Design a protein that fits this description.
The structure is cut from a larger assembly and holds 2 copies of chain A. By secondary structure, the first copy, chain A, is mainly β. Chain A contains no helices and 2 strands. Bound molecules: linoleic acid. The PDB classes it as viral protein.
Chain lengths: ~50, ~50
Amino acid sequence: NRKRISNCVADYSVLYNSASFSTFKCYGVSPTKLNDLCFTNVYADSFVI
Amino acid sequence: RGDEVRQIAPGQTGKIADYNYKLPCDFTGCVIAWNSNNLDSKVGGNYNY
Ligand SMILES: CCCCC/C=C\C/C=C/CCCCCCCC(=O)O
């Protein structure tokens, strides 16, 4: 499932309360800079494996 | 937590990396981690950590 994300603020500190992620790997960008950037056309591809 | 061991590394983000324990990228040294379920977990929940 591909979902478009647009016109929003990506705080992603609301995920700390509940969500725990086994793997989280970022390509083309350092994880420390994600709070200081804007993203042009964002798509979330979701599935289960 | 087990899922947060990946956060103990240079240039990582997450609750542990951001708010609890942060590593430099000019970090010379070794990170070691091992499961301790038989020690640090008890019935009813170990809430000392
Ligand atoms: C569903 C909306 C997503 C839109 C965000 C778009 C770009 C920003 C990417 C942000 C990182 C994803 C969240 C990871 C949370 C940190 C996990 C951790 O504790 O290590």
